[PDB]
Amino acid sequence: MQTFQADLAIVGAGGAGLRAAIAAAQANPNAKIALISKVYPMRSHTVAAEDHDSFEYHFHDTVAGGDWLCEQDVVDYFVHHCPTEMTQLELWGCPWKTGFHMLHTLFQTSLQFPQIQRFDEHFVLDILVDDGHVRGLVAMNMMEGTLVQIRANAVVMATGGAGRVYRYNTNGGIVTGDGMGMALSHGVPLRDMEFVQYHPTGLPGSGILMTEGCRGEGGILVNKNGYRYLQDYGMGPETPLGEPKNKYMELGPRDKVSQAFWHEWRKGNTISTPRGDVVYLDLRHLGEKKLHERLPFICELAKAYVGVDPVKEPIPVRPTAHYTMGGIETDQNCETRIKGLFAVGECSSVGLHGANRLGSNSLAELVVFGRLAGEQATERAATAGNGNEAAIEAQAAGVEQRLKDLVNQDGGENWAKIRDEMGLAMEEGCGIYRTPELMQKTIDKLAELQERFKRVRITDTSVFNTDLLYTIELGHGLNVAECMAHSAMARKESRGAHQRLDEGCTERDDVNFLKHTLAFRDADGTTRLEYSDVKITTLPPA
Amino acid sequence: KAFIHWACRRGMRELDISIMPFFEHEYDSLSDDEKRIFIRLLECDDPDLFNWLMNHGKPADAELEMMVRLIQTRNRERG
Ligand SMILES: *Cc1cc2c(cc1C)nc1c(=O)[nH]c(=O)nc-1n2C[C@H](O)[C@H](O)[C@H](O)COP(=O)(O)OP(=O)(O)OC[C@H]1O[C@@H](n2cnc3c(N)ncnc32)[C@H](O)[C@@H]1O
Ligand SMILES: [K+]
């Protein structure tokens, strides 16, 4: 166990973590900042991403788009610090694919700061907490096999969403919930985890995401009969072929277009395909000349992953799990219950997104709140004093043991299979619409799967195994999955991304459920729920 | 030498399906220092690796543009 004494450690080197690291280098130029990532940061999910004329119109559309589960004071902060962070990004070199341009700029800016020590290709296994205050973490160095103690008095979780918990998914296999997992291990609740958001056109089997631009440039969605079925679900009259209008038909509200898919499924109107049920995003009527100019990548994309030339046949699509509104619970400073420990970016719940993320508030949260979390954690690194050395070191030792008990564990279960059944149960029981019976089937399956998890075989693929890390991820996924399902099952209303079919729970219920779902995990392994109020300041519910 | 398995996890879901199973099903097939381009090419930006696979452009070191052909063609005979 090599060790490294830092002021702050940041777990995650995507948009949020990088912005946090720059923020901490600029706040205290004498700081040692450990910036840790299991992938070269330029491979963080943030690379993959592709009005505000008024603070009021933006605050209103975030709260309402989040169906009144937003922390309004956080929203007010956010909306008002958006222009600053956009300016600061352009100054840093970003020319005015937006997630790559963002991450590249953050990454190049981070290179100017000798305060920021990157720990590339390091897997963080646990955080060290004693007397209600974080004191560092312990990571594994992939590229060598060794384990590193990293001691800091503030730790910022920036680990990304909990996506790859659904079997069909838009996220890189990276995005496994590790940071939400670690918060749970230490009694920090996950908040509002029941609110997962789907993107309506994703490729079957893969989950690779077909851009809205497909429909902006006039592609239609039909069922098995070639019917543009969106007209049957409140989405205005059918618009002419080649003249779409925003908010109508294929450009309709993104949530209603997913729900439409589901209804078409229940009607018998889908197409049964290998690895899913699909409709068709049809682009044949554009022409390759249109398809080559605008939407140029989309052709090879379809040839490559669905084996379709979109000029000759339509593309199979279906709603895919995409963004997780919930995450580690944080206050208005991004600080968790555990003093000194922060969370920011997709892994957190700062109270910005409520029950439904609004547009590109996801990318801007990275730099607004990455800055805040960075500043705030610097502040708290300078005022924590020191900690009961034996306990910290004892805990750091316990990770070492726990990790060796894990290797050559007594068991014969296959983590691959355990992983896929969790994925299937997520799709079935926590999808577009939920029912108390499809949720309880899946709550059960997870319980069954996490028992088998206790007996998974990490075979001696040796230094330290890739198989062992994929297993630690699976564990993390499993615990956050129950948190989702338990919270969904228990939320007896329909709000934003969380939509229920059963009587009693089809309507939004502000008298009873204008509340956050906090999901704890006790040492015994069971999932405990709690609720907190929702800071309403300017905008009481409609 | 099994750490190149870890240089296969990408931020884009697209490269997980284009690079990870090609490393699995093959790689140990045509090796020697023709794998001198595999590792060399993994040390490149994720958009470039998505794009040079969709032929929205071509990589510079055309020793690496050959490797983009071997990954396209060997995968167009896969599934
Ligand atoms: C998946 C996705 C998301 C997305 C999108 C397209 C796709 C395919 N398009 C978007 C768009 O057009 N507009 C938008 O506003 N959002 C869009 N999104 C969502 C958005 O991209 C993400 O929510 C956002 O990028 C999240 O970024 P964040 O900075 O919070 O985190 P990250 O990029 O996922 O990276 C997390 C980092 O943590 C490291 N990590 C994770 N676990 C560990 C462990 N255990 N140890 C060490 N490091 C860890 C990762 O390496 C990563 O760097
Ligand atoms: K989030």
- Return the domain boundaries, chain B: 1-79
The distance between the two most distant Cα atoms of chain A, rounded to a whole number of Å, is: 72
At A36, is the secondary structure helix, strand, or coil?
Answer: strand
CA–CA distance, B5 with A335 (Å, rounded to integer) = 35
CA–CA distance, A115 with A118 (Å, rounded to integer) = 10
Ligand 1 and A214: CB distance under 6 A: no
Chain centre to alpha carbon of residue A265:
26
Q: How far is B34 from chain A (nearest CA, A)?
A: 22
CA–CA distance, A200 with A372 (Å, rounded to integer) = 32
Ligand 1 and A48: CB distance under 6 A: yes
Report CA dihedral (A49, B5, A139, B50) to the nearest 10 degrees. -10
Q: What is the DSSP letter of A411?
A: -
| Nominal resolution (angstroms) | 2.6
Q: Which strand (E) or helix (H) includes residue B8?
A: none
Cα separation values, A235 from A227, A248, A290, A413, A419, Å: 14, 5, 26, 48, 37
Chain centre to alpha carbon of residue A76:
22
Do residues A306 and A204 touch, judged by C-beta distance below 8 A?
yes
Q: Which strand (E) or helix (H) includes residue A129?
A: strand A122-129
CA–CA distance, B44 with B24 (Å, rounded to integer) = 20
Question: How far does the centroid of ligand 2 lie from the alpha carbon of residue B36, in Å?
Answer: 40
The distance between the two most distant Cα atoms of chain B, rounded to a whole number of Å, is: 31
CA–CA distance, A99 with A83 (Å, rounded to integer) = 17
Do residues B3 and A142 touch, judged by C-beta distance below 8 A?
yes
CA–CA distance, A499 with A492 (Å, rounded to integer) = 10
Mutate to test the pocket of ligand 1, among A35, A44, A157 (most ligand atoms within 8 A of CB): A44
Number of residues in chain B: 79
Do residues A331 and A535 touch, judged by C-beta distance below 8 A?
no
Pairing relationship of beta strands A116-120 and A33-37 according to DSSP bridges? parallel
CA–CA distance, A415 with A427 (Å, rounded to integer) = 19
Q: Which strand (E) or helix (H) includes residue A491?
A: none
- All residues of chain B having their beta carbon less than 8 Å from the beta carbon of residue A48 are 11-13, 46
Q: CB-based contacts of A444: which residues, under 8 Å, 6+ apart?
A: none
In chain A, % helix, strand, coil (3-state, to 5) comes to 40, 20, 40
Domain A198-322, what fold? Flavocytochrome C3; Chain A, domain 1 (3.90.700)
Q: CB-based contacts of A303: which residues, under 8 Å, 6+ apart?
A: A309
Which residue type sits at A491? R
Going by the annotation, the residues of the binding site of A are 12-16, 36-38, 44-50, 122-124, 158-159, 178, 322-323, 346, 357-363
Do residues A283 and A315 touch, judged by C-beta distance below 8 A?
yes
What's the CATH class of domain B1-79?
mainly alpha
Which residue type sits at A129? V
Q: Which of A45, A305, A466 sits opposite B6 (nearest CB)?
A: A466
Instruction: Measure CA of the first residue to CA of the last residue in chain A; give whole Å.
Output: 56
Q: CB-based contacts of A534: which residues, under 8 Å, 6+ apart?
A: A68, A69, A70, A71, A351, A514, A515, A516
Q: CB-based contacts of A226: which residues, under 8 Å, 6+ apart?
A: none
Pairing relationship of beta strands A499-500 and A433-434 according to DSSP bridges? parallel
Do residues A434 and A500 touch, judged by C-beta distance below 8 A?
yes
Assigned token pair, A377: 């954690």
Q: Which runs of consecutive H residues, i.e. helices, occur in A319-359?
A: none
- Count of alpha carbons within 13 Å of A279, Cβ hemisphere only? 35
Question: How far does the centroid of ligand 2 lie from the alpha carbon of residue A362, in Å?
Answer: 8
Q: How far is A171 from chain B (nearest CA, A)?
A: 6
Do residues A108 and A87 touch, judged by C-beta distance below 8 A?
no
Burial per residue of B19-53, b for 16 or more beta-carbon CB atoms within 10 angstroms, e otherwise: beebbeeeeeeeeeeeeebbeebbeeebbebbbbb
Ligand 1 and A363: CB distance under 6 A: yes
Q: Which runs of consecutive H residues, i.e. helices, occur in A229-287?
A: 254-266
B1 touching chain A per CB within 8 A: no
Q: Which runs of consecutive H residues, i.e. helices, occur in chain B?
A: 13-25, 35-42, 46-54, 62-75
CA–CA distance, A218 with B4 (Å, rounded to integer) = 42
CA–CA distance, A455 with B17 (Å, rounded to integer) = 29
- Count of alpha carbons within 13 Å of A245, Cβ hemisphere only? 8
Which residue(s) pair with A129 in the sheet? A134
Question: How far does the centroid of ligand 2 lie from the alpha carbon of residue A481, in Å?
Answer: 15
CB atoms within 10 A of CB A503: 6
At A337, is the secondary structure helix, strand, or coil?
Answer: coil
Q: Answer whether B46 sits within 8 Å of A47, measured CB to CB.
A: yes
Backbone angles phi, psi at A456, to 5 degrees: -90, 145
CA–CA distance, A356 with A326 (Å, rounded to integer) = 10
E strand intervals along A311-354: 315-324, 327-329, 341-343, 348-349
Backbone angles phi, psi at A412, to 5 degrees: -140, 20
Going by the annotation, the residues of the binding site of A for FAD are 12-16, 36-38, 44-50, 122-124, 158-159, 178, 322-323, 346, 357-363
Ligand 1 and A175: CB distance under 6 A: yes
* CA nearest neighbour of A128 among A4, A292, A39: A4
CA–CA distance, A149 with A128 (Å, rounded to integer) = 10
Q: Which strand (E) or helix (H) includes residue A340?
A: none
Which residue(s) pair with A278 in the sheet? A271
Mutation target among A18, A40, A42, A175 for the B interface, most CBs of B within 10 A: A40
* CA nearest neighbour of A290 among A202, A220, A203, A218: A218
E strand intervals along A377-526: 433-434, 499-500, 516-521
Strands in A341-343's sheet, in edge-to-edge order, are: A116-120, A33-37, A8-11, A154-157, A341-343
Assigned token pair, A379: 């502040």
Assigned token pair, A245: 């209008």
Touching A: B residues 4-63, CB under 8 Å: 5-6, 9-14, 16-18, 20, 45-47, 51, 53-56
Instruction: Measure CA of the first residue to CA of the last residue in chain B; give whole Å.
Output: 27
Do residues A370 and A158 touch, judged by C-beta distance below 8 A?
yes
At A499, is the secondary structure helix, strand, or coil?
Answer: strand
